[PDB]
Design an enzyme around this catalytic site. Structure first.
Site, PDB file in Angstrom:
ATOM      1  N   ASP A  40       9.126  -3.725   9.917  1.00  0.00           N
ATOM      2  CA  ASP A  40       8.476  -4.979  10.286  1.00  0.00           C
ATOM      3  C   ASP A  40       9.574  -5.801  10.941  1.00  0.00           C
ATOM      4  O   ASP A  40      10.480  -6.316  10.255  1.00  0.00           O
ATOM      5  CB  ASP A  40       7.979  -5.632   8.989  1.00  0.00           C
ATOM      6  CG  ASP A  40       7.592  -7.079   9.148  1.00  0.00           C
ATOM      7  OD1 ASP A  40       7.832  -7.680  10.206  1.00  0.00           O
ATOM      8  OD2 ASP A  40       7.041  -7.632   8.173  1.00  0.00           O
TER       9      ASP A  40
ATOM     10  N   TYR B 110      14.464   3.603  -4.603  1.00  0.00           N
ATOM     11  CA  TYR B 110      15.879   3.476  -4.242  1.00  0.00           C
ATOM     12  C   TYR B 110      16.925   3.615  -5.354  1.00  0.00           C
ATOM     13  O   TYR B 110      17.677   4.568  -5.335  1.00  0.00           O
ATOM     14  CB  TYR B 110      16.130   2.184  -3.479  1.00  0.00           C
ATOM     15  CG  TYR B 110      15.177   1.979  -2.342  1.00  0.00           C
ATOM     16  CD1 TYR B 110      15.377   2.630  -1.123  1.00  0.00           C
ATOM     17  CD2 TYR B 110      14.110   1.101  -2.457  1.00  0.00           C
ATOM     18  CE1 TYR B 110      14.506   2.421  -0.049  1.00  0.00           C
ATOM     19  CE2 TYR B 110      13.228   0.892  -1.382  1.00  0.00           C
ATOM     20  CZ  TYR B 110      13.444   1.555  -0.184  1.00  0.00           C
ATOM     21  OH  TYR B 110      12.585   1.322   0.877  1.00  0.00           O
TER      22      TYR B 110
ATOM     23  N   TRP C 296       9.600  -7.865  -4.713  1.00  0.00           N
ATOM     24  CA  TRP C 296       8.968  -6.598  -5.131  1.00  0.00           C
ATOM     25  C   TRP C 296       7.734  -6.763  -6.005  1.00  0.00           C
ATOM     26  O   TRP C 296       7.177  -5.758  -6.508  1.00  0.00           O
ATOM     27  CB  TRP C 296       9.993  -5.739  -5.890  1.00  0.00           C
ATOM     28  CG  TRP C 296      10.891  -4.969  -4.945  1.00  0.00           C
ATOM     29  CD1 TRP C 296      12.179  -5.240  -4.625  1.00  0.00           C
ATOM     30  CD2 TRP C 296      10.518  -3.808  -4.202  1.00  0.00           C
ATOM     31  NE1 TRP C 296      12.649  -4.300  -3.707  1.00  0.00           N
ATOM     32  CE2 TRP C 296      11.645  -3.415  -3.432  1.00  0.00           C
ATOM     33  CE3 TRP C 296       9.334  -3.067  -4.095  1.00  0.00           C
ATOM     34  CZ2 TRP C 296      11.623  -2.311  -2.589  1.00  0.00           C
ATOM     35  CZ3 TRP C 296       9.313  -1.945  -3.233  1.00  0.00           C
ATOM     36  CH2 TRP C 296      10.446  -1.584  -2.507  1.00  0.00           C
TER      37      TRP C 296
ATOM     38  N   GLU D 213      18.889  -7.795  -4.620  1.00  0.00           N
ATOM     39  CA  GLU D 213      18.212  -6.510  -4.430  1.00  0.00           C
ATOM     40  C   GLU D 213      19.232  -5.403  -4.317  1.00  0.00           C
ATOM     41  O   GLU D 213      19.091  -4.330  -4.936  1.00  0.00           O
ATOM     42  CB  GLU D 213      17.292  -6.566  -3.211  1.00  0.00           C
ATOM     43  CG  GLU D 213      16.338  -5.359  -3.181  1.00  0.00           C
ATOM     44  CD  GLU D 213      15.832  -5.004  -1.813  1.00  0.00           C
ATOM     45  OE1 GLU D 213      16.560  -5.171  -0.805  1.00  0.00           O
ATOM     46  OE2 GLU D 213      14.682  -4.506  -1.768  1.00  0.00           O
TER      47      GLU D 213
ATOM     48  N   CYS E 213      11.445   3.012   2.590  1.00  0.00           N
ATOM     49  CA  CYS E 213      11.458   2.659   4.018  1.00  0.00           C
ATOM     50  C   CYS E 213      12.847   2.853   4.644  1.00  0.00           C
ATOM     51  O   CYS E 213      12.994   3.529   5.676  1.00  0.00           O
ATOM     52  CB  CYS E 213      10.969   1.225   4.233  1.00  0.00           C
ATOM     53  SG  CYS E 213       9.424   0.857   3.395  1.00  0.00           S
TER      54      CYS E 213
ATOM     55  N   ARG F 120      12.368   4.317   8.368  1.00  0.00           N
ATOM     56  CA  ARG F 120      11.154   4.968   8.876  1.00  0.00           C
ATOM     57  C   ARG F 120      10.091   4.011   9.397  1.00  0.00           C
ATOM     58  O   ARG F 120       9.266   4.383  10.237  1.00  0.00           O
ATOM     59  CB  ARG F 120      10.533   5.889   7.813  1.00  0.00           C
ATOM     60  CG  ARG F 120       9.855   5.106   6.705  1.00  0.00           C
ATOM     61  CD  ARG F 120       9.087   5.988   5.721  1.00  0.00           C
ATOM     62  NE  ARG F 120       8.614   5.146   4.636  1.00  0.00           N
ATOM     63  CZ  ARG F 120       7.539   4.385   4.663  1.00  0.00           C
ATOM     64  NH1 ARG F 120       6.754   4.347   5.743  1.00  0.00           N
ATOM     65  NH2 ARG F 120       7.254   3.655   3.579  1.00  0.00           N
TER      66      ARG F 120
END
Lengths: 262, 262
Positions: B169, B94, B80, B58, B146, B166
């Site tokens: 989990d 991103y 994803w 990633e 995020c 922001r």
């Protein structure tokens, strides 16, 4: 405030000596976080006398999307004077990004109206965010934003906000930034019929200028006093309709002011 | 890790019920910060087996400026898949913002090469920053970023980084996100001939999904092990030339993996 003095002490305790383009030098640390419960009292530094007058005007100015200092001048607020150009312009700083962030395709995003709509209609959202960090316009700004972006949060009827401050002058800048954002939370909470929750302050490069050390040791010798109460005297029809005279602070009882040099 | 388990327990202690898009419910807090001294070890959670595999791909993918999941599919990374459209596109998330932030006047800013240049040639800059939060393109993205904004900092030859996240989990996402950015710091450090400093994780809405409770308790019942060590087995000639096989974890002896539903 206790948390503020703790940060001041931390910069003393573990700061690294650095240079700046100006050649004055800083003690710097990286990464910090503080939490102010706004129901405890309005977070205006008590270990030196601070003044809300310029803070309030600057915030109202931000909210109008104004980046010309004319309005600040109308009210004898001179905090942006050294950064403005001949026309009083600062380029697309804070207020412009908050109210009219330009998209690549010629549109403008009003982040303030967006966030109000979110707080009212989607208060659980984990993306209630305002950013001034417009990478594509930095080279147009008098200065890259220091208070770079902020996020709101709602739980149990209370509005909280976290600011990411990428660069922070602890002595001169931070007491001003804290009260500014606290005021914003109060206004946002009022407009959304929410209680005020926490203001969370997060710092990136967090420093004391080497020429503020004398002042810092004085201020660190002082015990914080209890915080004052903020009164908003009216409920305006919108976030864009507040007036300087709408705000009063009651019970502010600080230690004497401490003047810095420049 | 100690700080990670402390955060889990903080969410149990202080977390408030906050519903969501799906209606599963979370226990949520707002505003948290952790510091991982990367000199102490690589901050990969040991209280359940975690694996760098998807994390590395990633991150290599982000660094390529890619927002199409085809590369991830070619490498058997599925993380994803639920978000991509029929063409495999996620929109300008991103990778696109990191490598090619569109300016309003038709240019693209490579934030990654900017930061590299800053770390090498202007290490005391107070704005060594990457932002994914492109307000003007959020409407084009599969999801709003995020891990939205990160800042680098250099002191005494050591590279630190602070991430603003922001929404977090805690059980499933957070271990992944910590290792992701820690890996990025090690890579940047190697490319700039710096030592690794701290990774500072800062969270906004930081929550445990209510259906992660049994998992959380299992994990909290376990004693963290010594941190592993990251071995980079080859030094690429640019930050864009890493290969999956360059990275190895040493001294990683975790507790058993804990599977948790999405």
């Amino acid at each position: 405030m206790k948390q503020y003095l703790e940060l001041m002490q931390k910069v003393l305790d573990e700061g690294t000596q650095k240079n700046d383009r100006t050649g004055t030098g800083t003690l710097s640390i990286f990464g910090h976080q503080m939490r102010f419960n706004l129901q405890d009292g309005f977070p205006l530094v008590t270990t030196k006398r601070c003044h809300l007058r310029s803070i309030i005007h600057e915030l109202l100015w931000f909210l109008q999307g104004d980046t010309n200092i004319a309005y600040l001048h109308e009210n004898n607020v001179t905090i942006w004077d050294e950064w403005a150009d001949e026309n009083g312009d600062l380029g697309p700083v804070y207020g412009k990004q908050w109210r009219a962030w330009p998209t690549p395709d010629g549109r403008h995003i009003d982040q303030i109206t967006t966030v109000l709509n979110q707080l009212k209609n989607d208060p659980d959202s984990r993306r209630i965010i305002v950013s001034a960090w417009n990478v594509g316009e930095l080279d147009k700004m008098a200065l890259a934003p220091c208070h770079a972006f902020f996020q709101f949060y709602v739980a149990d009827g209370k509005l909280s906000c976290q600011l990411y401050q990428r660069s922070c002058d602890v002595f001169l800048g931070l007491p001003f930034n804290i009260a500014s954002y606290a005021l914003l939370v109060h206004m946002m909470a009022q407009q959304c019929d929410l209680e005020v929750g926490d203001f969370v302050w997060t710092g990136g490069d967090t420093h004391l200028w080497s020429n503020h050390m004398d002042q810092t040791h004085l201020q660190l010798s002082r015990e914080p006093r209890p915080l004052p109460k903020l009164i908003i005297k009216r409920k305006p029809e919108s976030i864009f309709d507040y007036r300087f005279e709408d705000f009063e602070i009651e019970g502010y009882d600080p230690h004497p002011g401490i003047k810095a040099p420049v």
